[PDB]
Design a protein around this ligand. Structure first.
Ligand SMILES: *[C@@H]1O[C@H](CO)[C@@H](O[C@@H]2O[C@H](CO)[C@@H](O[C@@H]3O[C@H](CO)[C@@H](O)[C@H](O)[C@@H]3O)[C@H](O)[C@H]2NC(C)=O)[C@H](O)[C@H]1NC(C)=O
Ligand SMILES: CC(=O)N[C@@H]1[C@@H](O)[C@H](O)[C@@H](CO)O[C@H]1O
Ligand SMILES: *[C@@H]1O[C@H](CO)[C@@H](O)[C@H](O)[C@H]1NC(C)=O
Ligand SMILES: *[C@@H]1O[C@H](CO)[C@@H](O)[C@H](O)[C@H]1NC(C)=O
Ligand SMILES: *[C@@H]1O[C@H](CO)[C@@H](O)[C@H](O)[C@H]1NC(C)=O
Ligand SMILES: *[C@@H]1O[C@H](CO)[C@@H](O)[C@H](O)[C@H]1NC(C)=O
Lengths: 379, 655
């Protein structure tokens, strides 16, 4: 059996029925009976009670999560629960699909996302091809800013080009603080390429401030990881046109499609383990008792659960609860305020739709660099 | 208003003292404007039931902060986790009273957590201080492989790299294991005589037993451990006379309540005077939103400097941990612990006591027992290092020089004796040659003793980038020397830029260049047959050599090396055999070896003069005591004339 949980959207009663309906979807050899659960609000006791009750009155083997309005500090509860009751879970979307690096020792979380190292690698593989090498790094006072600042330096020494760094700055971009100081610091900068790391509210504040202090015209280029930019389906105001981010595959699928992948990966994991030993491990769901030392059977099942492949999509989870070797796709903000694909990435080679970077102006009418020319030839 | 605080306490007798202390602080503080309020709950064993009780408490009041402590259960890891997880959802600050673990200070997971006691990872500071104090610079690090184990190493390595000390080999062991002997056997061969232990109390006992079994606790050896490695099962098996440390007010749980209450009561006034009186959520179900003023309260809480508590002034660090905590150095004399020194904020002050080192000595035991035995690596070459099978009895065959003189030989272990396929067969062989004679003279003239062993890989040595990594690694004789498997390289090693950055060489003892081998117009600048690859002639050399890197550093010779990459040999003998039977076309290498081969093996002629200049040298690790000695000995040998007769004996047999 496999459980499914929704959160914080338009009431998916029709979606819940459509997910519960295919009791035999023929998506894998053998199909455990699926069941659905829905929480009204996201809260500690609400979540704890719902999961403990469902997994104690259902005897479930695996459970698949579905995210919410993308608020932080929610994946920690899932890690806590999985570590306590030794049930493998899986996060699929939203803010709960943000990589948690130092997870609990005996936990089995397996949240599908990409660590900052891979995103930075992809970004520097697009900086090298257009040959910018400016490196104006801006980071807010965020919990994970030290990791980003270490990672950028680590990757900078892992390439051929010199990557002459210009300046790194840290500013208080929170809800409350002195705007004049940040205005003064932003007003003094000179670099054609910026890399920024902050939260969505921090992103909007920083972009509004940059628009105030004239750093958003056709002269500069901005780059951000997937942590910012929020919903991906509603770009707010003051977001510069030409923003570049890197998101994983399946950034445009449906909620129902994602759950179909979640149940498929659990089903193949059981089927792959079935060929080895011809069984399905019994559930261990005593939330009230909370027993259990290290168990070898569940450990072996989790070890066999790591690698999976189906429908021509390689899902390989690292020991840390994040997948390794995905096929990221770069996206950018078109001239009409709409996210669009720019360049794929597949086994370490980058592609682009445009041989040169389109540069737009305040009144559009794409400007062309005066000191750039095209040369024709043949062999 | 009536601001309210909460707390989780152990035995509910601490709760009465907590209430009395908070009432006393209410009496002392405040100008009859704001009153503080108290409520507490006892710790229960189930973590999930713990969290349920926590937001039962959270609904029970507009809690402004939480104080958490440990129960009598020794499992100190998971107990203060659930309260942090629950109270971090709404950014309600929580303060840990007497928790010492190194995973709670990662301010990305536990979102709002403070400590009134420094963690275990801060122990490396006193190690560094007392390490400078006693003038020790040769260090062995020995820490467990867990996350807590891997945190002290990072900070100590940061300090030592800041001083560019570059501590010697650090050893990692899996926690909860038996037969830990292998790591200690690997470490005992090293030179440093001070080792640092940091692990769980159980692993300390087995490490102590292994050290006693292997007699690593003999005189001269000096130990120094942490607070968690002395008490418990480890105290019974602990070797006598080892330095240790402890915290002054550890596990008191009475002063910590007081000063935590004091600092919280000091911070609440500064919070409320900021027009941000917005109340915390009342209900663990009611509101799915964070506190609107939690980050501000945490920020003003961290920078709140208290005046004077029972444990003194308290002030927090940018990562949230408590700073400026001062320990008590401990020593073990006759199975009775006695204090020998007191840590200050930065320095360490001894206090009218004498240390008893494990050997019972009275003076400061200097480390680094100097070594006269040192291992020497070598590679097989034709006119420098001959290798031959040993005699049937076990010794070497007794030979003589043509001029009526013995030939000096040594016994050499080494490889599988079969390059292509063999798992492991290290049968000793017999070595002799010109380079070996130089080694014998050097050994005689400086009192040291050698143990010559051949190379494993068989490659001269190059730098390569391992797959799925950018950290370059040295492969071959270079890697063997850098790792520590060798102490000197006595072999025809070429001196160049790529090696001088990590090796201190010696003055050259023989100059040589680069020629080409042709069986009997291949110029040196550029041949169109070489510049433009052909079908018959192949211009390639043995892989992992220096000429390979030299051609990979070129532009048109880069194209030549791209053509060559399909062909790469493994030894000089292979190339000689291939070019002798017309199977090979071109081969470029050193002038001396090629000239010797042409003089010995007829019908083969070298093309062109030495179009390059270089030299051979003895290779050693950077900052080694023997370098100056060896360089002056080589220069004196050059001036004496020894090299002349030696070369007349070996390099040219009057051809
Ligand atoms: C703080 O000021 C308020 C003034 O109203 C008082 O707090 C009250 O303290 C009592 C005793 O801890 C709480 O009673 C509790 O009731 C529940 C359910 O009835 C029971 O299960 C508990 O064992 C406990 O007895 C009461 O809820 C609480 N009320 C408020 C509004 O805080 C009290 O006088 C002052 N001191 C403390 C410690 O609260
Ligand atoms: C911050 C700090 O510790 N300051 C001083 C320290 O420099 C000095 O060594 C010690 C007495 O020796 O008194 C204290
Ligand atoms: C990895 O994939 C192989 C190939 O199907 C499978 O047999 C194995 O169980 C998977 N897991 C591990 C840990 O090898
Ligand atoms: C612990 O603290 C109390 C009060 O702060 C103090 O009186 C006592 O000396 C300390 N040590 C012990 C062992 O109780
Ligand atoms: C250690 O604590 C403080 C920190 O400097 C200091 O005032 C005190 O005298 C030291 N010694 C003891 C025994 O507390
Ligand atoms: C190297 O030279 C020094 C100084 O002349 C002398 O002690 C000896 O010859 C060598 N020293 C060592 C430690 O090998």
């Amino acid at each position: 059996t496999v459980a499914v949980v929704f959160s914080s959207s338009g009431p998916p009663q029709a979606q819940f029925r459509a997910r519960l309906t295919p009791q035999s979807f023929l998506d894998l050899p053998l199909e455990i009976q699926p069941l659905t659960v829905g929480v009204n609000t996201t809260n500690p006791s609400s979540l704890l009670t719902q999961i403990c009750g469902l997994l104690g009155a259902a005897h479930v083997h695996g459970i698949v999560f579905e995210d919410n309005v993308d608020t932080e500090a929610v994946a920690q509860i899932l890690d806590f629960i999985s570590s306590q009751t030794h049930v493998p879970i899986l996060s699929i979307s939203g803010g709960s699909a943000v990589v948690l690096t130092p997870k609990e020792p005996g936990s089995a979380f397996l949240q599908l996302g990409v660590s900052l190292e891979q995103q930075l690698q992809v970004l520097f593989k697009v900086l090298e091809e257009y040959d910018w090498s400016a490196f104006a790094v801006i980071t807010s006072l965020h919990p994970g800013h030290a990791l980003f600042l270490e990672g950028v330096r680590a990757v900078a020494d892992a390439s051929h080009v010199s990557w002459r760094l210009l300046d790194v700055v840290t500013l208080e971009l929170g809800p409350g603080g002195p705007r004049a100081r940040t205005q003064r610091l932003l007003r003094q900068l000179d670099a054609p390429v910026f890399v920024a790391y902050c939260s969505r509210e921090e992103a909007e504040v920083l972009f509004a401030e940059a628009a105030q202090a004239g750093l958003v015209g056709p002269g500069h280029v901005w780059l951000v990881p997937n942590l910012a930019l929020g919903s991906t389906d509603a770009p707010p105001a003051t977001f510069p046109v030409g923003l570049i981010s890197v998101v994983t595959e399946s950034w445009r699928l449906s909620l129902r499609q994602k759950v179909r992948d979640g149940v498929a990966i659990l089903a193949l994991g059981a089927h792959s383990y079935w060929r080895q030993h011809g069984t399905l491990p019994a559930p261990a769901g005593d939330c009230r008792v909370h027993p259990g030392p290290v168990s070898p059977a569940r450990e072996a099942f989790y070890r066999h659960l790591l690698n999976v492949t189906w429908e021509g999509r390689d899902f390989s989870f690292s020991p840390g609860g994040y997948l390794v070797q995905p096929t990221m796709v770069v996206i950018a903000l078109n001239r009409h305020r709409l996210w669009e694909m720019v360049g794929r990435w597949e086994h370490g080679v980058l592609y682009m739709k445009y041989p040169v970077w389109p540069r737009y102006s305040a009144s559009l009418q794409p400007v062309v660099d005066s000191r750039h020319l095209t040369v024709a030839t043949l062999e | 208003k009536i601001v309210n605080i909460g707390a989780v306490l152990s035995t509910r007798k601490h709760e009465q003292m907590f209430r009395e202390a908070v009432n006393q602080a209410n009496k002392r503080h405040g100008s009859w404007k704001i009153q503080l309020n108290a409520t507490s709950v006892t710790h229960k064993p189930n973590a999930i039931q713990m969290a349920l009780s926590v937001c039962e408490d959270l609904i029970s009041s507009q809690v402004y902060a939480i104080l958490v402590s440990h129960p009598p259960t020794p499992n100190d890891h998971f107990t203060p986790t659930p309260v942090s997880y629950t109270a971090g959802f709404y950014r309600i600050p929580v303060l840990g009273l007497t928790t010492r673990m190194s995973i709670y200070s990662d301010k990305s997971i536990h979102l709002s957590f403070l400590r009134t006691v420094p963690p275990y990872s801060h122990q490396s500071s006193v190690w560094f201080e007392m390490m400078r104090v006693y003038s020790w610079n040769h260090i062995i690090l020995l820490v467990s492989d867990d996350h807590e184990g891997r945190a002290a190493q990072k900070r100590l390595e940061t300090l030592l790299e800041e001083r560019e000390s570059k501590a010697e080999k650090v050893l990692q062991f899996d926690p909860g294991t038996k037969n830990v002997t292998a790591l200690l056997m690997e470490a005992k061969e090293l030179e440093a005589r001070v080792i640092i232990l940091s692990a769980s109390e159980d692993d300390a006992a087995t490490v102590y037993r292994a050290a006693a079994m292997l007699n690593m606790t003999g005189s001269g050896y000096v130990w120094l451990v942490g607070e968690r490695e002395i008490s418990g099962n480890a105290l019974r098996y602990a070797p006598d006379g080892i330095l240790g440390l402890q915290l002054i007010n550890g596990k008191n749980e009475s002063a910590h309540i007081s000063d935590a209450v004091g600092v919280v009561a000091q911070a609440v006034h500064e919070l409320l005077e900021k027009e941000n009186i917005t109340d915390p959520p009342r209900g663990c179900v009611g509101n799915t939103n964070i506190w609107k003023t939690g980050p501000l309260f945490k920020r003003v809480l961290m920078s709140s400097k208290y005046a004077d508590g029972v444990t003194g002034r308290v002030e927090f660090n940018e990562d949230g941990d408590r700073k400026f905590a001062n320990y008590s150095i401990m020593n073990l004399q006759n199975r009775k612990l006695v204090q020998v020194g007191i840590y200050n904020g930065t320095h360490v002050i001894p206090n009218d006591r004498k240390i008893i080192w494990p050997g019972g000595e009275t003076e400061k035991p200097r480390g680094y027992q100097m070594s006269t035995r040192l291992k020497i690596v070598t590679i097989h070459q034709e006119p420098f290092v001959y290798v031959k099978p040993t005699l049937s009895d076990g010794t070497c065959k007794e030979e003589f020089t043509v001029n009526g003189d013995p030939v000096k030989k040594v016994i050499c272990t080494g490889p599988n004796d079969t390059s292509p396929g063999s798992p492991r067969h290290t049968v000793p062989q017999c070595c002799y040659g010109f380079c070996i004679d130089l080694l014998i003279k050097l050994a005689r003239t400086m009192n040291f003793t050698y143990e010559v062993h051949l190379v494993a890989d068989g490659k001269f040595g190059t730098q390569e980038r391992v797959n799925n990594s950018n950290k370059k690694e040295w492969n071959g004789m270079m890697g063997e020397l850098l790792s520590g498997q060798a102490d000197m390289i006595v072999a025809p090693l070429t001196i160049n830029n790529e090696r001088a950055q990590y090796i201190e060489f010696s003055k050259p003892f023989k100059y040589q260049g680069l020629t080409i081998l042709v069986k009997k117009r291949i110029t040196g600048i550029n041949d169109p047959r070489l510049r433009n690859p052909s079908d018959k002639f192949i211009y390639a050399t043995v892989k992992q050599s220096s000429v390979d890197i030299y051609f990979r550093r070129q532009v048109e010779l880069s194209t030549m090396y791209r053509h060559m990459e399909k062909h790469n040999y493994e030894s000089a003998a292979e190339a000689i055999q291939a070019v002798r039977d017309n199977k090979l076309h071109a081969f470029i290498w050193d002038s001396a070896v090629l000239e010797f081969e042409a003089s010995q093996k007829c019908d083969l002629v070298t093309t062109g003069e030495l179009f390059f200049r270089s030299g051979f040298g003895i290779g050693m690790r950077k900052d080694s005591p023997w370098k100056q000695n060896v360089s002056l000995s080589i220069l004196k040998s050059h001036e004496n004339g020894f090299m002349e007769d030696l070369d007349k004996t070996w390099v040219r047999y009057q051809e």
